[PDB]
Design an enzyme around this catalytic site. Structure first.
Site, PDB file in Angstrom:
ATOM      1  N   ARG A 155      -0.518  -8.326   1.320  1.00  0.00           N
ATOM      2  CA  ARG A 155       0.772  -8.715   1.890  1.00  0.00           C
ATOM      3  C   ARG A 155       0.765  -8.862   3.405  1.00  0.00           C
ATOM      4  O   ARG A 155       1.511  -9.673   3.959  1.00  0.00           O
ATOM      5  CB  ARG A 155       1.838  -7.688   1.519  1.00  0.00           C
ATOM      6  CG  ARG A 155       2.213  -7.645   0.044  1.00  0.00           C
ATOM      7  CD  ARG A 155       2.994  -6.386  -0.235  1.00  0.00           C
ATOM      8  NE  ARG A 155       3.393  -6.286  -1.631  1.00  0.00           N
ATOM      9  CZ  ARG A 155       3.624  -5.142  -2.256  1.00  0.00           C
ATOM     10  NH1 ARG A 155       3.480  -3.984  -1.617  1.00  0.00           N
ATOM     11  NH2 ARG A 155       3.994  -5.167  -3.528  1.00  0.00           N
ATOM     12  N   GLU A 197      -0.968  -3.915  -0.459  1.00  0.00           N
ATOM     13  CA  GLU A 197      -0.372  -3.950   0.890  1.00  0.00           C
ATOM     14  C   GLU A 197      -1.239  -4.744   1.867  1.00  0.00           C
ATOM     15  O   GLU A 197      -0.711  -5.461   2.724  1.00  0.00           O
ATOM     16  CB  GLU A 197      -0.132  -2.534   1.437  1.00  0.00           C
ATOM     17  CG  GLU A 197       0.815  -1.693   0.578  1.00  0.00           C
ATOM     18  CD  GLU A 197       2.283  -2.128   0.618  1.00  0.00           C
ATOM     19  OE1 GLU A 197       2.581  -3.268   1.056  1.00  0.00           O
ATOM     20  OE2 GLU A 197       3.153  -1.310   0.204  1.00  0.00           O
ATOM     21  N   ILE A 231       1.227  -3.089  -8.820  1.00  0.00           N
ATOM     22  CA  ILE A 231       0.301  -2.586  -9.826  1.00  0.00           C
ATOM     23  C   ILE A 231       1.106  -1.985 -10.968  1.00  0.00           C
ATOM     24  O   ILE A 231       1.976  -1.150 -10.747  1.00  0.00           O
ATOM     25  CB  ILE A 231      -0.658  -1.551  -9.228  1.00  0.00           C
ATOM     26  CG1 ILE A 231      -1.580  -2.237  -8.217  1.00  0.00           C
ATOM     27  CG2 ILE A 231      -1.485  -0.843 -10.335  1.00  0.00           C
ATOM     28  CD1 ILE A 231      -2.452  -1.281  -7.443  1.00  0.00           C
TER      29      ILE A 231
HETATM   30  N1  LIG Z   1       3.008   0.123  -7.714  1.00  0.00           N
HETATM   31  C1  LIG Z   1       2.625  -0.679  -6.646  1.00  0.00           C
HETATM   32  O1  LIG Z   1       1.688  -1.422  -6.741  1.00  0.00           O
HETATM   33  C2  LIG Z   1       3.374  -0.585  -5.401  1.00  0.00           C
HETATM   34  C3  LIG Z   1       4.079   0.553  -5.045  1.00  0.00           C
HETATM   35  C4  LIG Z   1       4.770   0.599  -3.843  1.00  0.00           C
HETATM   36  C5  LIG Z   1       4.727  -0.509  -3.028  1.00  0.00           C
HETATM   37  N2  LIG Z   1       4.044  -1.632  -3.330  1.00  0.00           N
HETATM   38  C6  LIG Z   1       3.383  -1.645  -4.495  1.00  0.00           C
END
Ligand SMILES: NC(=O)c1cccnc1
Ligand SMILES: CC(=O)N[C@@H]1[C@@H](O)[C@H](O)[C@@H](CO)O[C@H]1O
EC number: 3.2.2.22
Length: 246
Positions: A163, A160, A71
């Site tokens: 994933r 997440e 993000i």
């Molecule tokens: N910023 C994000 O979307 C992020 C942060 C940590 C792990 N995965 C994604």
């Protein structure tokens, strides 16, 4: 774009949204039947827009980098918000340019910095669909400390979950009641890059990891993942970070 509405949401509709989120990300190949995210994408096509609606029908639009499911920032009404990091500054050249103002959040988007800003580690923040509803509502009106916790919820319930099927299932179990993430959830989140790398390296190594990955399983025990016949590879992980970005 993809969209998700919290009003009327249930485990089935959330599962469908996460399927759609995964399938919105481009890939040219699969490695052990898992989509391999692209090394790079130029221009605006690098960013997926996620439209999220809270229970009251208020909405934010979230920009996701399709090479790593990170993000970058989000739009709430006429204000855009971006993490304080070069990738998000770049993203802001392409998404939400029509926003009347841009706020750069006082932290980067990684867990370490978000946890410091929130004053709490992930381990202590309940997640679930009610927490996501709360997170959307919080992000509607700027509050950087509150937003850090909301973003920790948002990241885990969208990126997440995309994933890892296990994390998707954990959020489905939390459709109507929030609960802090399991140790297994934390371990998978912390290991996505490493798992992604080893699965790609296993190609050319007969499915065998060059370096084992240690996880915590659903029963709270340490387990070592050494090859692609592990359930974490055959059933769980759904997207691979390209080694070009590791
Ligand atoms: N910023 C994000 O979307 C992020 C942060 C940590 C792990 N995965 C994604
Ligand atoms: C050579 C090797 O590492 N083999 C393992 C095997 O023992 C294990 O049962 C399987 C599933 O985890 O993963 C692989």
């Amino acid at each position: 774009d993809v969209s998700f509405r919290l009003s009327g949401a249930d485990p089935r509709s959330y599962g469908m949204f996460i399927k759609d989120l995964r399938n919105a990300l481009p890939f040219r190949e699969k490695v052990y039947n898992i989509p391999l995210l692209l090394p790079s994408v130029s221009g605006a096509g690098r960013y997926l827009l996620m439209h999220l609606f809270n229970y009251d029908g208020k909405t934010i639009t979230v920009a996701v980098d399709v090479t790593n499911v990170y993000i970058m920032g989000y739009l709430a009404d006429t204000t855009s918000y971006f993490f304080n990091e070069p990738a998000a500054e770049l993203a802001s050249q392409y998404v939400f340019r029509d926003a009347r103002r841009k706020i750069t959040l006082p932290y980067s988007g990684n867990y370490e910095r978000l946890q410091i800003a929130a004053g709490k580690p992930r381990e202590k923040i309940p997640i679930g669909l009610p927490a996501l509803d709360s997170a959307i509502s919080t992000l509607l009106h700027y509050d950087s400390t509150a937003a850090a916790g909301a973003l920790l919820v948002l990241i885990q319930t969208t990126a997440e979950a995309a994933r890892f099927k296990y994390i998707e299932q954990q959020i489905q179990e939390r459709a109507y009641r929030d609960e802090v993430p399991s140790l297994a959830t934390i371990s998978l989140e912390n290991s996505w890059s490493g798992l992604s790398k080893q699965i790609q390296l296993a190609q050319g190594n007969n499915g065998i990891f060059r370096t084992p990955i240690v996880l915590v399983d659903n029963k709270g025990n340490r387990v070592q993942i050494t090859n692609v016949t592990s359930k974490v590879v055959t059933s769980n992980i759904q997207l691979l970070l390209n080694t070009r970005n590791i």
